[PDB]
Amino acid sequence: MAGNSIGQLFRVTTCGESHGVGLMAIVDGVPPGLALTEEDLQKDLDRRKPGTSKFATQRKEPDQVEIISGVFEGKTTGTPIGLLIRNTDQSSARETAMRVAAGAIAKKYLAEKFGVLIRGHVTQIGNEVAEKLDWNEVPNNPFFCGDVDAVPRFEALVTSLREQGTSCGAKLEILAEKVPVGWGEPVFDRLDADIAHAMMSINAVKGVEIGDGFAVAGQFGHETRDELTSHGFLANHAGGILGGISSGQTIRVAIALKPTGRHDPCVGVRATPIAEAMLAIVLMDHFLRHRAQN
Amino acid sequence: MAGNSIGQLFRVTTCGESHGVGLMAIVDGVPPGLALTEEDLQKDLDRRKPGTSKFATQRKEPDQVEIISGVFEGKTTGTPIGLLIRNTDQSSARETAMRVAAGAIAKKYLAEKFGVLIRGHVTQIGNEVAEKLDWNEVPNNPFFCGDVDAVPRFEALVTSLREQGTSCGAKLEILAEKVPVGWGEPVFDRLDADIAHAMMSINAVKGVEIGDGFAVAGQFGHETRDELTSHGFLANHAGGILGGISSGQTIRVAIALKPTGRHDPCVGVRATPIAEAMLAIVLMDHFLRHRAQN
C-alpha cells in the first residue's frame, strides 16, 4: 500500500498504478501569477528518455500529462493544481511521472523568482569515472555526462554490458545554484534532511551525500583562520548547507543508485531528471516555509 | 525557529533552548503497558558521556529528566508522555537530550515487543579504521569501537589531535537486528528515506547510506549464478530494505560526520547514541503505521 504525500507547504499528493487507467497528482501551494502550460511539464517528462527523435523502435509519442485545474488563462490561480496522465498501456517510468511534472512546476517558479538553477550529472557508471564538468556537454550525450572524453568510455562499458546479461551502478551529482541563504528547519526538518528524504524516494538509491559527503570521515579539520592575503575559504565543503540551513552557495547533493530489446545496462542514469525534480520540490517547500516565517 | 516535530504516529514534539529554563518533549503513539521509568531514560542520556568515573576535570550531578505524564504505576497508559529537563548552572550539548530520551522509549518497546536490537559503532576516526566487530568490546572503550586492536590506534590518533588543536571526522555504522519484514511506506515515506531524514538531524552528518551504500555505484549485476557452488543472498547488499520496505534482514546504516580547555577532535563518536535513537524513533513510527494499515 502507499504513503503518498510530500511537503508541508509545497505539497504533492499522488495516486495511480502503472498498469491502471491513469496517474494523478494534486500540488498545493504554488503562488498565483506563474505562467504555466502542459508543454512545461512534457519537456521534463520527455527528458527521462533522451531522444531526440532517436530512441528504441516504434516511437509513438508518449503519454501526455494534462492540467485539470489551477491555471486560468495561462497563469496559476493560487489554487490546487491537478495533473492527470491517462495511460495508454497499448516500464517503471510511469512510477516516476507525477514527481517530475510536479518538480518542473517548482523548477520554473524558482527560476523565474530567484534564478535558481537545478541540474544533475552522472559522474560515474560502474568503473568509469568522469573528471570534468561542462554543462553544454550533458545534453549532448545520453548518460547526462559532462566530461566529453568520458562519454566514449561510458559508451563502451555499456555496449560491453549489453553483450553479457549484466547491469552496472551509477552515481549522480545534483547541484542547485543561486539558492538564497536561510532555507531549512532544524531540528528535524533541516534542508539536508528533507533533501535526503526526497532523493531516497527514487528506487535504487542506496546513499545520499552533501558537500564532500562520505569523504568527510577521513578528513581533518583545518581550514581556519590562517596566514596571508586572500583569504577564504570557498571550496564549499558543506555543499551549500550549514547547520541544516542554506548558505548562499551552490548546493551539492550526490546519490548512488544500484544495479537493477529490453536491456538496461544502466537505468540509474535515467534517474537524473527525477533526482533533479526532488531537489526542486524540497527547495520550493522550504522557500514557502522561510517566507511564512519572515 | 524550528521544525520541532518528527513522526506521523509515533510522534515526538520538542522545545527548549540550551540556555533556557529547560527542555521538553511530548511523545505520541506508545501503546499501553510497557514498563518505563525515568531510570530507563537516564541510562540512554548518560551514555553520551562515556565517563563512568571519568573525563576532563570534575564531575556534575548531572541534569535529570523527569517523566510528567503517560505513566501509571510504572507503565505506559498510552496517553501522551511528557518529558522535562530542568537546566542548571555552576554546561551541556543538550539539544540532543530529548531525542535520546524519546528514542529510549522506542528502543525499549521494540526490544520487548519484537526482540529488535539496535546498536551503533565507530568504524572510522580520520585516518584510522576498525576492522572487526565484537559487540562486547563497544562499551569497553570511549570510542564505541568494536575492534580491540583498533582502539589503541584510535586513542593515539585522538591524543595527538587534541594537543595539535586539530579535529577529524568519523564514520559510524548503526545496525537494527530482528526487524520484521513489511515496514515502510513508499512512495515518499519509504523507511530508508525516513532513516536518512532522521540521521541528518544529527549535526555534522554529511552523508547517509543504507546497506552497501555508496559502494553500489561501482557494482555490476548478477542477482545469482547457477552452480554446484554459490554466494547465497544474505549478504545484505540491501542493508535490510528493498523498495523502501523492511525485508527481515538486519538493517544497516552508515553515517559520515565531519570535523568540528575542553576540546573535540572527534565529537563525532559521541553521536553514536543519538544515531541509535533516531533509528529507533523511525522504526517505531513505521511499526505503528504498519499496524494502522492492517
Q: HSE on the CB side for A243, CA within 13 Å? A: 9
Pick from B168, B203, B220: which is nearest to A259 by CB?
Answer: B220
B207–A214 CB contact, under 8 Å: yes
A217–B169 CB contact, under 8 Å: yes
Cis amide prior to A187 (ω within 30 degrees) = yes
Q: How many residues does chain A have?
A: 294
Q: Is B258 marked as binding a ligand?
A: yes
* Domain segments of chain A as ranges: 1-294
CA distance B280 to B107: 5
CA distance A209 to B215: 13
Residue A216's nearest CA partner among B171, B167, B155, B203 is: B171
Q: What is the 3-state secondary structure (H, E, C) of chain B?
A: CCECEECCCCEEEEECCCCCCEEEEEEECCCCCCECCHHHHHHHHHCCCCCCCCCCCCCCCCCCEEECCCEECCEECCCCEEEEEECCCCCCCCCCHHHHHHHHHHHHHHHHHHCCEEEEEEEEECCEECCCCCCCCCCCCCCCCCCCCHHHHHHHHHHHHHHHCCEECEEEEEEEECCCCCCCECECECHHHHHHHHHCCCCCEEEEEECCHHHHHHCECCCCCCCCCCCCCCCCCCCCEECCEECCCCEEEEEEECCCCCCCCCHHHHHHHHHHHHHHHHHHHHHHHHHHCC
**In whole angstroms, how far apart are CA B71 and each of A141, B22, B76?**
62, 21, 5
Q: How far is B274 from chain A (nearest CA, A)?
A: 13
CA distance B211 to B239: 3
Show the cell assigned to B175. Answer: 545496525
Q: How far is A73 from chain B (nearest CA, A)?
A: 32
Q: Does A9 touch chain B (CB under 8 A)?
A: no
Torsional class of B6: left (φ above 0), alpha (ψ -120 to 50), beta (otherwise): beta
Can you tell me which residue has the cell 507525477? Answer: A98
B221–A259 CB contact, under 8 Å: yes
Alpha helices in A163-228 (DSSP H): 191-199
Cis amide prior to B187 (ω within 30 degrees) = yes
Torsional class of A7: left (φ above 0), alpha (ψ -120 to 50), beta (otherwise): left
CA distance A87 to A98: 13
* Method in brief: X-ray
Show the cell assigned to B50. Answer: 562515556
CA distance B133 to B152: 15
Using a CB-CB cut-off of 8 Å, the residues of chain A touching B199 are: 196
Q: At what angle do helices B97-114 and B272-292 cross, to 10 degrees?
A: 50
CA distance B41 to B15: 18
Show the cell assigned to B257. Answer: 560526520
CATH architecture of A1-294: 4-Layer Sandwich (3.60)
Q: Does A5 touch chain B (CB under 8 A)?
A: yes
Q: How far is B139 from chain A (nearest CA, A)?
A: 21
Using a CB-CB cut-off of 8 Å, the residues of chain B touching A197 are: 188, 193-194, 196-197
A219–B193 CB contact, under 8 Å: no
- The strand pair at B245-246 and B128-129 is best described as unpaired
CA distance B217 to A13: 31
- Residues followed by a break in chain B (C to N exceeding 2.5 Å) are 90, 260
The alpha carbon dihedral of B232, B236, B242, B246 has a sign of positive
Enumerate the β-bridge partners of residue A26: A13, A82
Residue B75's nearest CA partner among B116, B111, B26, B31 is: B31
**In whole angstroms, how far apart are CA A159 and each of A15, A87, A283, B120, B252?**
37, 32, 37, 42, 34
Q: Does A249 touch chain B (CB under 8 A)?
A: no
Nearest CA in chain A to B157: A220
Q: How many residues does chain B have?
A: 294
**Residue A14, φ and ψ in degrees, nearest 5:** -130, 165
Q: Is A270 marked as binding a ligand?
A: no
Give the rounded distance of the alpha carbon of A235 from its chain centre: 23
Window A:17-46, CB contacts with B under 8 Å: none
**Residue B75, φ and ψ in degrees, nearest 5:** -135, 160
Q: Is B259 marked as binding a ligand?
A: yes
- Contact partners, residue A194, CB within 8 Å, separation at least 6: A184, A282, A285, A286, B197
Can you tell me which residue has the cell 529554563? Answer: B21
Q: Is A79 in contact with A86 (CB distance < 8 Å)?
A: no
Using a CB-CB cut-off of 8 Å, the residues of chain B touching A188 are: 3-6, 198, 201
Q: Does B121 touch chain A (CB under 8 A)?
A: no
The alpha carbon dihedral of A140, A143, A148, A151 has a sign of negative
Taking 3-state DSSP, the helix, strand and coil percentages for chain A, each rounded to the nearest 5, stand at 25, 25, 50
B208–A207 CB contact, under 8 Å: yes
Residue B91's nearest CA partner among B65, B50, B59, B67 is: B59
Using a CB-CB cut-off of 8 Å, the residues of chain B touching A124 are: 217-218
Q: How far is A194 from chain B (nearest CA, A)?
A: 6
E strand or H helix at A39? helix A39-45
CA distance A39 to A116: 20
Show the cell assigned to A125. Answer: 557508471
Q: Is B239 in contact with B213 (CB distance < 8 Å)?
A: yes
CA distance B24 to B12: 10
Show the cell assigned to B263. Answer: 576540546
CA distance B289 to B185: 8
Q: Does B164 touch chain A (CB under 8 A)?
A: no
B206–A187 CB contact, under 8 Å: no
**Residue B164, φ and ψ in degrees, nearest 5:** -70, -15
Which of A210, A216, A281 to mutate: most B Cβ within 10 Å?
Answer: A216
The alpha carbon dihedral of B233, B238, B240, B246 has a sign of negative
CA distance A184 to A190: 5
CA distance A198 to A284: 12
Q: Does A294 touch chain B (CB under 8 A)?
A: no
Which of A197, A255, A278 to mutate: most B Cβ within 10 Å?
Answer: A197
Show the cell assigned to A279. Answer: 531537489
